Amino acid sequence: NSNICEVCNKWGRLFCCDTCPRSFHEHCHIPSVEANKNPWSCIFCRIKTIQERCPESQSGHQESEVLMRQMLPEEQLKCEFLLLKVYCDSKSCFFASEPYYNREGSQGPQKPMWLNKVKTSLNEQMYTRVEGFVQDMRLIFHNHKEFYREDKFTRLGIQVQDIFEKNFRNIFAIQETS
Ligand SMILES: [Zn+2]
Ligand SMILES: [Zn+2]
Ligand SMILES: [Zn+2]
């Protein structure tokens, strides 16, 4: 197995996947690495199994249909993986914890949102459809863009949203378009 966490790229107290060479900090993996279970399979492996069991699940889908899906176990998993793929980028640090807003010429968002809040919401089964999860994720980046206005820091929101959107299109097999 790898000797660094797949998500944050640091060493430490790592749990190793049994079916692939990735490793994780306990709370870096989503869901948090499970207490027992030998063997243990990571979320990457669990997602690959879904695909392998239903190869047609990789055919193109419309985003509008994906968003209306109820959060049954497979969609829960897919949203957990999508969240993890965002944490995998180091620029996620900016959006992880609860933000605060005191900048001359700007007013904070009406509905603040952050990664750790989304993480808690998934853990607590608060989303009933994929749409809930995707709306809160997109709100993170939209709040950022609106607040930071012409400051060049706005670009961090564009960058991490792009990671989100690419991974959303891949994990939910969104039909490719120009
Ligand atoms: Zn880690
Ligand atoms: Zn694995
Ligand atoms: Zn099948």
Side-chain angles (χ1 to χ4, degrees), residues 1-36 38-178:
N1 290 66
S2 181
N3 308 332
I4 55 170
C5 180
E6 186 80 356
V7 185
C8 73
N9 299 106
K10 298 291 193 285
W11 182 71
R13 181 55 195 115
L14 301 173
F15 303 84
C16 290
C17 181
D18 288 310
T19 47
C20 81
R22 302 174 171 93
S23 311
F24 306 82
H25 299 103
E26 175 164 12
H27 300 308
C28 282
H29 196 270
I30 309 182
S32 293
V33 168
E34 299 74 7
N36 209 288
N38 321 57
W40 178 77
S41 267
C42 79
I43 190 153
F44 295 79
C45 283
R46 296 170 67 188
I47 290 287
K48 186 206 299 316
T49 294
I50 302 320
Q51 292 171 16
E52 288 179 345
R53 286 177 165 158
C54 292
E56 66 269 37
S57 74
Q58 305 161 281
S59 293
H61 299 79
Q62 299 294 113
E63 178 173 316
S64 61
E65 178 271 319
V66 167
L67 296 185
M68 292 305 314
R69 298 179 189 164
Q70 303 181 8
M71 290 283 262
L72 292 181
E74 283 184 1
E75 303 317 301
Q76 179 74 36
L77 196 72
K78 283 175 167 211
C79 292
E80 291 165 344
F81 187 50
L82 176 50
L83 183 56
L84 176 135
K85 283 294 193 146
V86 174
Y87 283 104
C88 287
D89 197 282
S90 65
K91 294 163 179 279
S92 74
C93 70
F94 295 111
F95 297 106
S97 72
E98 187 173 1
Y100 62 83
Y101 298 97
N102 196 1
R103 184 199 189 239
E104 176 179 341
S106 284
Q107 270 290 333
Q110 306 291 314
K111 188 177 166 179
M113 193 47 62
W114 60 98
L115 300 170
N116 294 348
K117 185 176 172 67
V118 180
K119 183 181 279 204
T120 293
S121 298
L122 272 174
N123 174 243
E124 289 181 4
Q125 300 159 303
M126 301 291 291
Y127 300 111
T128 62
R129 290 173 196 271
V130 172
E131 184 177 51
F133 166 80
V134 168
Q135 281 173 338
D136 276 353
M137 294 293 286
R138 295 172 163 165
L139 182 62
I140 300 171
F141 312 114
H142 194 257
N143 283 351
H144 176 98
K145 288 167 72 172
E146 295 302 300
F147 180 72
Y148 291 104
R149 306 285 202 112
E150 313 303 281
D151 193 294
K152 64 193 173 170
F153 192 60
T154 59
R155 183 160 170 263
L156 269 293
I158 293 169
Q159 293 175 322
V160 180
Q161 180 148 24
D162 195 44
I163 299 295
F164 175 74
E165 299 294 343
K166 285 182 189 275
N167 281 278
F168 173 68
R169 292 189 302 272
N170 176 262
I171 290 167
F172 289 96
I174 297 293
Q175 174 63 49
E176 291 276 289
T177 58
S178 59

